[PDB]
């Protein structure tokens, strides 16, 4: 039951993050404006390519 809780809560959190979205005219892609450290951008893009 605990892991069911954490899965469901996180998934709610994912939907919350997805609420913040580029409402484009036609794009099926999304362009999000986010603040992020310049320190870790190498790990950022490593994660993205993963």
């Amino acid at each position: 039951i605990r892991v069911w809780f954490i899965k469901v809560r996180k998934m709610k959190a994912i939907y919350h993050t997805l609420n913040l979205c580029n409402i484009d005219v036609t794009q099926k892609c999304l362009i999000a404006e986010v603040w992020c450290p310049v320190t870790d951008l190498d790990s950022i893009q490593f994660a993205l390519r993963r």
């Binding site: 484009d24 005219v25 036609t26």
Partner: protein
């Protein structure tokens, strides 16, 4: 990054409108053209059956 986003939309709109209109026009004209072709070939078939019935007589 700000130019291509509208280029996509414009070419997509062009394709959608042009293709729906072209299909509808193709449809309306193929009605009459198929009608004419089928009717004339029917008349030629009627000539063929005229020939066959004359031979049988």
């Amino acid at each position: 990054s700000q130019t291509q986003g509208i280029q996509q939309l414009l070419q997509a709109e062009k394709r959608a409108a042009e293709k729906v209109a072209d299909a509808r026009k193709r449809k309306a004209r193929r009605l009459k053209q198929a009608k004419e072709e089928a009717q004339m070939e029917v008349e030629q078939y009627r000539r063929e059956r005229e020939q066959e019935f004359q031979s049988k007589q």
